[PDB]
Amino acid sequence: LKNRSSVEVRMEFVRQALAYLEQSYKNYTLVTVFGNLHQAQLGGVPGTY
Amino acid sequence: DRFGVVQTTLPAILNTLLTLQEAVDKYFKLPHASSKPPRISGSLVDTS
Amino acid sequence: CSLGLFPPPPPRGQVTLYEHNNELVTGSSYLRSEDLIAEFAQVTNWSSCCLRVFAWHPHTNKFAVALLDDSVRVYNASSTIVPSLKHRLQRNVASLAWKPLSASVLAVACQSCILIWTLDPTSLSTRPSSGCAQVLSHPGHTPVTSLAWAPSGGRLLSASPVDAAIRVWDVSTETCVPLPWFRGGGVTNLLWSPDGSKILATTPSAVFRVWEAQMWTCERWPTLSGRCQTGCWSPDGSRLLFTVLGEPLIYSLSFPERCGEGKGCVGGAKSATIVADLSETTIQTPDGEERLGGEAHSMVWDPSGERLAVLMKGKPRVQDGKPVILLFRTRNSPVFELLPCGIIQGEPGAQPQLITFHPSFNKGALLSVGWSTGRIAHIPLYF
Amino acid sequence: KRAVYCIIGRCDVTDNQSEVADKTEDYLWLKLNQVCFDDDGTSSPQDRLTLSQFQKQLLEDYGESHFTVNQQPFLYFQVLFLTAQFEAAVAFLFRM
Amino acid sequence: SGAPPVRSIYDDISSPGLGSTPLT
Amino acid sequence: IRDNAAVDGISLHLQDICPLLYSTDDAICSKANELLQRSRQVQNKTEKER
Amino acid sequence: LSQYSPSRRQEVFSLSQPGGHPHNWTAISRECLNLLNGMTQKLILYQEA
Numbered sequence: 210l211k212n213r214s215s216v217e218v219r220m221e222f223v224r225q226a227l228a229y230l231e232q233s234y235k236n237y238t239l240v241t242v243f244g245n246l247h248q249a250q251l252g253g254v255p256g257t258y
Numbered sequence: 259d260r261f262g263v264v265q266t267t268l269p270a271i272l273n274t275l276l277t278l279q280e281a282v283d284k285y286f287k288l289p290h291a292s293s294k295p296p297r298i299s300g301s302l303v304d305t306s
Numbered sequence: 307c308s309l310g311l312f313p314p315p316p317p318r319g320q321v322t323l324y325e326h327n328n329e330l331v332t333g334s335s336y337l338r339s340e341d342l343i344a345e346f347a348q349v350t351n352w353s354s355c356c357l358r359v360f361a362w363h364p365h366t367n368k369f370a371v372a373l374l375d376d377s378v379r380v381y382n383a384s385s386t387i388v389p390s391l392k393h394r395l396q397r398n399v400a401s402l403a404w405k406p407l408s409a410s411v412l413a414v415a416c417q418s419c420i421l422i423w424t425l426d427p428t429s430l431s432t433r434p435s436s437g438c439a440q441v442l443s444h445p446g447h448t449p450v451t452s453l454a455w456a457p458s459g460g461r462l463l464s465a466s467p468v469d470a471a472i473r474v475w476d477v478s479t480e481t482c483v484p485l486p487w488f489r490g491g492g493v494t495n496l497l498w499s500p501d502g503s504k505i506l507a508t509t510p511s512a513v514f515r516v517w518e519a520q521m522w523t524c525e526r527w528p529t530l531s532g533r534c535q536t537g538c539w540s541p542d543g544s545r546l547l548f549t550v551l552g553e554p555l556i557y558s559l560s561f562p563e564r565c566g567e568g569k570g571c572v573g574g575a576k577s578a579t580i581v582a583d584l585s586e587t588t589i590q591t592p593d594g595e596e597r598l599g600g601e602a603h604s605m606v607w608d609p610s611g612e613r614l615a616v617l618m619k620g621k622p623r624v625q626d627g628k629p630v631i632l633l634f635r636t637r638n639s640p641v642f643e644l645l646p647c648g649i650i651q652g653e654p655g656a657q658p659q660l661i662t663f664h665p666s667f668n669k670g671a672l673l674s675v676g677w678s679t680g681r682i683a684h685i686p687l688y689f
Numbered sequence: 690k691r692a693v694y695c696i697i698g699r700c701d702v703t704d705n706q707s708e709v710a711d712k713t714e715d716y717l718w719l720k721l722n723q724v725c726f727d728d729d730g731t732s733s734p735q736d737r738l739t740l741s742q743f744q745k746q747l748l749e750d751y752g753e754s755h756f757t758v759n760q761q762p763f764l765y766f767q768v769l770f771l772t773a774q775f776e777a778a779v780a781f782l783f784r785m
Numbered sequence: 786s787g788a789p790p791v792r793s794i795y796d797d798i799s800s801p802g803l804g805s806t807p808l809t
Numbered sequence: 810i811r812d813n814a815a816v817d818g819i820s821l822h823l824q825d826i827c828p829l830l831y832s833t834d835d836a837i838c839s840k841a842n843e844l845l846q847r848s849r850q851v852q853n854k855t856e857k858e859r
Numbered sequence: 860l861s862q863y864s865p866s867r868r869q870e871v872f873s874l875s876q877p878g879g880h881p882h883n884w885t886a887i888s889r890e891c892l893n894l895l896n897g898m899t900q901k902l903i904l905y906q907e908a
Contacts, residue, residue, distance in 0.1 A: 213773075216726050216727075219726055219740055219773070220726055222773040223721050223740060223773075226717070226721055226771040226773070227718065227721050227722065229771065230714050230717060230718040230721070230771065231718070233714060233794060234714070234715075234718075234794060237795065237797070237798070240798055241797065241798075244851075244852065244853030245851065245853065245856060246852075247813070247850045247851065248813070248847070250813070252879055253879060253880045253881065254261075254262060254263075254266055255266055256266070259872045260872070261872060261873075261874055261881065263872050263881040263884050264872065264884065264888075267884070267885075267888050270892065271888070271892070274892055274895050274896060274899070275895070277899055278895055278896075278898065278899045281898075281899045281902040281903060281906075282902065284906060285902050288906070294480070297480060299444070299482065306479045306481060458862065502862070503863060519863075520863045564864070705786070705789075707790070710790070711790060711792065712790055712792045712793060712794055712796070713789055713790055713791060713792055713793060714793060714794050715790075715794075716789045716790055747789075751788060751789060755788065755789070755791070756789075756791055757791055761791060761793075764791065764792075767793075798855070800855035800858070800859065802854055802855060802858070
């Protein structure tokens with residue numbers, strides 16, 4: 210109850226929940242682009258931009 | 259580099275240079291791996 | 307430009323502290339081998355000065371100082387501990403050169419050899435062992451007067467007025483490559499351009515030789531009255547400034563870029579231009595006529611190319627023959643200009659013995675001055 | 690230009706940015722970036738989402754009949770577990 | 786208005802089709 | 810359609826420059842065709858049927 | 860060429876038409892990395908031996 214009530218541990222739960230939701234959208238944006246490559250025009254430069 | 263082409267490879271370059279510098283600086287700690295060989299100056303055959 | 311365009315020297319007892327807004331703010335304080343070194347040393351009185359050489363490290367707040375006892379000392383802004391370098395072959399030190407792209411390597415010119423010191427950058431002991439001092443020498447290349455590393459860190463040059471060949475050294479394979487030419491004298495000073503594509507080499511004669519670092523070619527400059535005394539490259543390597551002993555003149559020589567294939571030729575314009583005169587003028591001051599003019603003994607440019615410092619030496623009719631520091635503001639594009647900025651002055655009775663800029667000062671420029679009092683000053687120029 | 694400011698400046702918790710956020714992961718991600726844990730009394734309460742407010746807002750102020758639990762059960766488990774309501778998320782996942 | 790949507794990001798990927806027997 | 814800009818923006822520009830004319834059904838047929846010729850290159854089955 | 864000719868560095872960074880790919884850089888870098896990793900392994904196998 211003191212670990213689950215910590216400010217630090219509740220920041221960490223939200224820091225991980227945001228990291229999960231961001232990598233989830235990174236998976237979805239990767240799949241969307243790799244299906245539609247002819248629209249997407251991805252070229253030959255790696256990186257989220 | 260108006261295309262950022264080299265930057266895409268920069269992480270792999272730094273990894274291979276640092277792991278090679280590790281291999282060289284693990285190696286140069288070995289016995290006789292630090293001693294310089296005696297040289298004759300002005301030979302017609304090179305010793306480089 | 308000419309000396310008749312400078313602002314007056316500061317009133318007798320004030321010291322120049324810094325440049326700001328383009329103005330110099332003041333306050334109340336902050337031969338044998340040996341006579342042949344004294345003929346070609348960068349220090350205006352190398353035979354009586356306490357300080358024989360100063361050199362900044364090319365990236366960090368570390369500097370090396372050669373003293374009259376043939377110590378080299380090393381100072382660092384993050385160390386109260388000062389290493390004292392003294393080898394058994396270390397005698398009549400003429401030049402110091404730090405290796406670029408290295409925290410830890412210093413070259414020293416001596417009467418009988420070159421010494422390459424290795425210094426452990428975290429563990430700066432007060433007196434490092436004589437094993438930490440790699441010795442380089444060649445029969446006839448003695449005394450050594452000047453040393454110049456390539457900007458890429460992989461090559462070192464050395465000069466000797468006795469020897470009609472620049473010695474290129476690889477310090478890592480321990481090879482020696484003389485560059486012999488066909489008469490003229492030996493070598494007095496050596497200066498790389500910042501690109502590492504060109505090298506100036508001066509001689510005891512009224513001839514200098516510029517060299518190419520790709521094909522190791524040579525381009526000759528023989529229509530001089532006296533010896534080429536000193537010079538400096540622009541930050542781009544496209545211009546070379548030089549001065550002639552007996553002439554009060556700053557010359558400039560341009561080198562356009564290799565927009566073309568298939569030949570090693572050094573590639574300068576067919577002549578120099580004159581850009582500043584240092585003739586024997588008056589300037590009016592609250593303290594009367596002051597008289598200025600003489601011969602430019604040293605010249606040093608900032609890394610930014612916006613400030614040129616010139617160590618003039620007066621004739622024995624002008625300020626008793628004292629040396630003076632002139633500061634010029636420079637422009638390199640589209641035109642090459644030398645504008646005046648002012649006159650740099652120290653402790654009442656001090657004389658400037660050496661000048662040099664800091665290579666990595668993130669607030670305009672920083673001028674190191676070595677004084678005849680044995681003091682070092684560091685004068686920032688804020689721009 | 691709204692949504693990026695509503696995130697970086699933790700403001701207008703009263704707007705869902707639904708001209709950009711169509712989906713429950715983007716609603717969770719928007720509101721989770723808007724979370725404070727810190728009693729800075731210079732913040733006005735109309736901008737002030739705590740994790741505790743958001744936990745209740747999903748479990749009690751919207752509930753299992755908002756998230757269509759029988760058709761998208763793993764989405765309600767995702768809503769509770771990413772808000773660290775692990776005990777309620779287990780009590781839910783143990784009913785089915 | 787203030788209430789949430791009820792959809793995942795994968796709904797654009799899970800569109801109707803044969804689900805099965807992946808050849809070629 | 811060939812060099813793969815979206816026709817929608819040029820189809821709309823062709824209408825502002827007309828006070829009221831036919832210049833509409835050719836633009837709809839052009840969008841119908843753009844989507845059909847893109848469907849031929851598209852390899853995601855879901856996307857192709859969409 | 861990498862020190863003494865800028866035009867021949869611009870030949871290395873150039874994108875090869877039609878497909879926009881940096882074939883000059885991705886050949887040169889790849890074989891330099893093959894040789895450097897070959898030396899890393901040649902040093903490891905000597906330290907083991």
